[PDB]
Each structure stands twice: as C-alpha cells, then as structure tokens.
Amino acid sequence: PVARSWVCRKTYVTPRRPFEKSRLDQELKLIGEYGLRNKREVWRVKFTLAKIRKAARELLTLDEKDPRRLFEGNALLRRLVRIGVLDEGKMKLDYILGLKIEDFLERRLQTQVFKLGLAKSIHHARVLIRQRHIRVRKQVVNIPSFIVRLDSQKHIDFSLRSPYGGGRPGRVKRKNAKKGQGGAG
Template structure:
C-alpha cells in the first residue's frame, strides 16, 4: 500500500501539472523537476520524459527499483527473502554507503 500511495502522489502531481497551460512557468519548472527525479531513479526512460508517461507508471515499476529486488535480480541472494536478510544484516553497500533498509530506492547511477 505504501508503493501505491507513492505512485498516487506522483500521478496526482503529473495530473495537476497537465491541467496548467503548457507555457506556464510553474508547469515548466515543476514538470522538469518531476521528470528529472523520475529519470534519476530509473522510473522513466530517456525517450519517455513527458508528463503523459508518468500517468502510465505501475506499482511494478516502482517495486523493481527497491534494493531488495536489485540484490535478488543480480544473483547475490537465493530468494527475495534472503536478499532482505542480507540487507538487514548490513552485508550490502550502495556506492560507499552501507544500507540496511530493504525498501531503499536505488538510483540508476548507483
């Protein structure tokens, strides 16, 4: 439900910006900031940097960016539950930072 709430907030922000005039400074500034943030986390591809694509996001896309999922997909853990245990026991680093939160959202640069 937390992921659904986060997705709902992103969609609401995009819907609000889409109702504004395309040349409105608020839409331009906040829209670019929203798209830049979503691109940084890998939620949108470089060719999808428009507010319309934000409305098409799914919870699956958000869940794929979690550290727990990344550890499992890279083969560092035998299961998603094993990945969670490894993260909680502080065996996993993201960059130079030791992370012990399985729900940590991994950026594309990490």
C-alpha cells in the same frame, strides 16, 4: 516554549473497502513476488505513486508554456528518470500517468540485489540486507526499501566487514572452527 519540530506525515493510505477478493489477491501477488513484510509497504508505494499521479495530473490541466508547468514538469521528470522507473526518452507528462507500482517496487534494494544475483532469492535478499551484508557505493545499507538510482545501481556490492567480501567470518563459523580444533590434537 520547546524547540521541537512535530512535522510528520503518514506514508500510506488504507483501502476504503475491506475484504475484496480481487484486491486482496492483487496485493498478495505483489507481496509474495517482491518479498514484502506486510500490506502497509505495498500501500506505501501505492500512496507514493498516487502522489506522483496527482502532481502530474495537476500540471497537465495547467496551461502549456506556464512557467510552473515547465519548471516543475522537468523537475519531477528529472527525478523519475534518476531513480529509473521512467525511460530516458520517455520524458513526457503523459507517460507518467501510465506508470504502475511494479516498477516502483523493483527499484527497491531488496529487488535489485536479487536481480544483481548477489542474493539467491527475493526473501534471501531481505534477510541479507537486514543482516548488514550489502553496501551501496561505500555506505552499508540495511534498509530493504532503499530505492536505488541509475548511478548507484552499478555500485551495489557486499560490505567489506561481511563474511562475503573481506575476511572476519561469522561467529557460528568461528565456534564451529574452535570446536573442531578442540575435539582433536
């Protein structure tokens, strides 16, 4: 019949137990520190790490010199150092199990623009990114969860159309300007 795809998967897992005072504060620490909207996206990155930990753990139980362990071993190590959460010289499967979620959270675009100084605050960063102001390479990106790679980290900058790089100021500046010239000769 139809030529659809219906290939979808959930990107997060809810906690087994609700209402732990320890877990609620730990997630709220991260949400406030990294300026996140809700607990789904701290659960999402946690789910991402768990999938990486599960894949890394499976390879570790796999016998050494196994082609699959060798091929997929450097495959996941290659992309972990590409995004930047893993040190260039820390290229061992053991060191992956030591990864946390803070490093996976600071690679976010909202965090990097704040750290780059383009934004005055982590929460300024989210609204700045969402308002189509920042760009990576020559592409404007309006998603805070855009993880950046080591190569793309330097290119992060203001978009040309935004009232921070090129000209063309915002409407409120124009309306204020036209009101000023309309109030006098």
